[PDB]
Amino acid sequence: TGREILEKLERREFTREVLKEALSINDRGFNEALFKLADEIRRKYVGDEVHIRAIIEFSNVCRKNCLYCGLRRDNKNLKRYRMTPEEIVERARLAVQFGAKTIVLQSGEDPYXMPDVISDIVKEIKKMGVAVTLSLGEWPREYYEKWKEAGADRYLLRHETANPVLHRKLRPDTSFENRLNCLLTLKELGYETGAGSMVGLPGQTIDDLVDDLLFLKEHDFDMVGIGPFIPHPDTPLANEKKGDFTLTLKMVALTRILLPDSNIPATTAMGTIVPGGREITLRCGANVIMPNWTPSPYRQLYQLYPGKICVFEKDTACIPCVMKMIELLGRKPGRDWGGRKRVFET
Template sequence: MIFDRFYEPVNEVTADQVWNLVLRIYAGEKLSYQEFLYLVSHFPQRLLAPTQRLAVVRRQSIYGKELFIRGLIEISNICAQDCYYCGIRASNNDVSRYAYQYGQLRQTIQRAYDKGYRTIVMQSGESNYFKDSELTHFIRTVTKTWPDLVITLSLGQKSREVYQAYFDAGARRFLLRHESADPTHYAQLHPPKQTLNSRLNCLKQLKEIGFQTGAGFMVGSPFQTSASLAHDLSFIQTFQPEMVGIGPYLNHPQTPFADQPNGDLEHVLTCYALARLIVPEALLPSTTATSSLDPQSGRLRALQSGCNVIMVNLSPPDQREQYSLYANKSYKGDESDEYLALIAKDVEKAGMVLTMHQGNHKSHVAPNPPSEPTDASTTLAKLSQS
């Protein structure tokens, strides 16, 4: 169980101590693991709103009102790993597997570029279906064809040599969620051959190579405790990822955890706000899983908790159905006018402005190009063009 006292009455002394820890993070101080543990164990629901406000103030001081929009392409659901929580795990024989052909992938990227996207996220299950040399060549071709397009990869654990080849070919961001920084908890979520040490070593290598590197974790996953979550917050404080992917645990009927309860939205929002304060310059997505947990207001509440990135799924509808990491995935028609109108409404309510430029981390050496006027109506009108 996480956030042990979240929905329980907390005395004023305890609340003041927790708030003092939040203010110390906001001031740029580093907390110890024990302090994170106290914060998570005693954080009361009534401190969520003021913590969210601090997160928004911090985000605006760094990124202004900009909300970066990315194009997501789920290039394959073939996976050799067997994570106990994931719907595309290798042992799931009920899922129909697919993989993009390079020509199809190039066409999808061309359409995205024509719509104005300047960051493309290529995500897949972890496998060797795509030969490393062929994928490296494809990345090089893409970056030469569209020099101002940033390629983000989310392909799982690879060797350092492969990561280096991707980087040399022009890929500049890599997402690899660590899922849990608590070794005991990590082992409860994965088979023995998958270890936390190997995961963290990959993250270390990605940073050393020069990628804008994304880590992240689930909130409310089976066996997660406040101690586990304290490890996650402590890890992102130490590692300082350029991107932080956080979302609720959502069960899938074809996994060993099918009967486990989903994560709690307000716990997720608390983690978004804390992550923004712990890693102020991070690119922090409002994840699809969060919108799936609460289709009506999940994305808006994430933006109000410090998030500054959203992803639009550009994969064909039939493939989106098969890239099912969890049940009841939200917004399967991401390019529809209806969906884009929902984004526009949330952006306006959050007081943010959509932008389609690269949206790099502030430490990245290549500055963002000047962005055109990108009020929500202008940007979404462009996205809606066929």
């Protein structure tokens, strides 16, 4: 029964059986209780601070051909761009001026910068007294080492799907094995490390989602980024169904319940498939938000999926917008860099 699954979740009985049932039950009352539980756990372990990570999507050049992604190399129906290192550093500075305490640098897997240009940029941004998070994809261990030495604090490398067969089909250049090795390497080098998956991928099952939850729990990641699959018309998956918002929200809720002291964003994809989706997600276990800080004319060209929010807004709109969001939610902005604050328990 729903009540019994909740009781088992409250007792930390995180068995594969309990998780599958949580994700399988479609009862409104159960879902609402699950969301309330995650919301409460969030409040108790990580408080009311919502940490703002200003994201600069500095290049849409990619060497990989992931079947879901609008930046995949086979997509010829996309103007490619690269911000200069000077543009990136000064764009970060403007975010810092606007109060950002973390700068996230995200890109396609664009060889041009790797590794030295990134290292240079990271060094300049670290001078500003903020955290630096990288989200640049899979690279050799030596690049990750150089970036850590340059002062990067965190690395986001969503695991996408913990089903290796699905993973290899959707990401034909690589493998789940590679992805995991990258994540373990990032952990070994001392990064705060972020994983996470998409929900509603073509061919992905509820059991797969359970496996994603158990994977996250096993590796105790510092951040977990979860969003629905959103089909992109210039990709092989154009005609596939989008991920379900409620199911994805349950995955966020259960991630909070499983990893109570983790950092969990309300992802842009959540706000894209449902108006006000991020705000809902922040009330169901999330404690991080990532306003778009990519400038025009480039912001509109970073089209991982269609309809992306923030694209029509002015260059500087998104930080103020999320500060308003945080206040209207009755929440507080992050005071510090919002690094993981581990609560050791049993």
